[model samples]
Target: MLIVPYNLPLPGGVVPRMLITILGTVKPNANRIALDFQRGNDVAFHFNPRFNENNRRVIVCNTKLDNNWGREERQSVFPFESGKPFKIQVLVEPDHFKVAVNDAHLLQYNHRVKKLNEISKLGISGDIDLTSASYTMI
Candidate 1:
């Protein structure tokens, strides 16, 4: 099992056709989990799934630059279950990232920080038991 708040380098940085995969199990009482594509101190894409926000399940996606977070793009379709394993896939495209959960298409987040290559780090944190986090080329 992998550790939480994990950070791994993207070999040649993020690029089109790269597919990021995360395998994990949600904690029995998980409230939130986050996966991020980062560039130094800035976050190019922040993918967060929250289980109990205002009694609603939601996913929040955003970008952070210059120490400030951008507008959040929220989705209400909950795809995760507490105490269950999950597979998350993020496919990098020319202009956006296509996300899938458990083999189903979830949502897309467009590039907010245009320099994809600069996003060289991947981070996963919060209430989940991480099994693996890796990337492959399409």
Candidate 2:
């Protein structure tokens, strides 16, 4: 995985956020993709293409795993299956964690106990086709 830190704190009071994106692509530049945010239960949101055009996409959720998993802070893209290269970017703030996909689709979750510094590592799984998955804390 690659790491590219940022001059963050979101320039505001924004808390933790996550994003699963594809570096460069056509359309959905930063407004389309699919995602799942963890709340009482993980909620998957699918960016509607009908509202736009062909590539009707944005972050979407396809599952609501009872997952009962708590404070796991699990915010990263995982290939439901292998052979596909995907990107997962997470922005952990003081109040919430927001994420996006293809740098287009977006999602966010608020942790029970918010701590942006508790971050120890960022992981990228699945086949190693990752051009680079990295983050630098700014």
Candidate 3:
């Protein structure tokens, strides 16, 4: 099990086109990637991509708030590979987060919590081996 590995505080907060690069893998057992934005203890945005053994490596995206879940978004096209290196890019917009896996557009999650600056910390976890995780301002 992985703990909160990426806990970098966004001092200036995420702005438009601000890119977060997550470099990691699915681990040995074939798992998931969880990236989250935190304002205190509340999660403003949670991005989870799971690799289902039941499906053809299908990916699902969802969120949790106060332990309550929202609607789930599934994608049949799974691009992440277990035990392999991968790159994930999250582009921050005014109202949504655009995600790309290995340079390919994956999905977008609209901001449920409208205050973007409230996102002060980024949390990450998985069975994945994280080689590098960082962000750049645009």
Q: Per-candidate TM vs. native?
A: 0.98, 0.38, 0.84
Candidate 2 local lDDT, 3-95, one digit each (tens): 222112222222334333323222223323332332323332212112123443222223233654333332333222223334555565556
RMSD of candidates 1 onward, in order: 0.7, 10.9, 2.6
Query: Which pairs in model 1 have colliding backbones?
Result: none
How many steric clashes between backbone atoms does each model show?
A: 0, 45, 0
Sort the predicted structures by TM-score, highest score first: 1, 3, 2
Tens digit of lDDT per residue, candidate 1, span 43-118?
9999999999998889999999999999999988889999999999999999999999999999999998888888
Candidates 1 and 2, the one with greater TM-score: 1
* Winning candidate number (TM-score): 1
Cα lDDT listed for each candidate: 0.93, 0.35, 0.76
Can you write out model 3's per-residue Cα lDDT over 1-138, one digit (the tens) per residue? 234466767876777778888887668766667787876666777776677656556555655677776777676766787778789898998778888899999888888766677777888876677777788987
- In model 3, the Cα lDDT at residue 108 comes to 81
Candidate 2 off by > 4 Å: 1-68, 71-87, 136-138
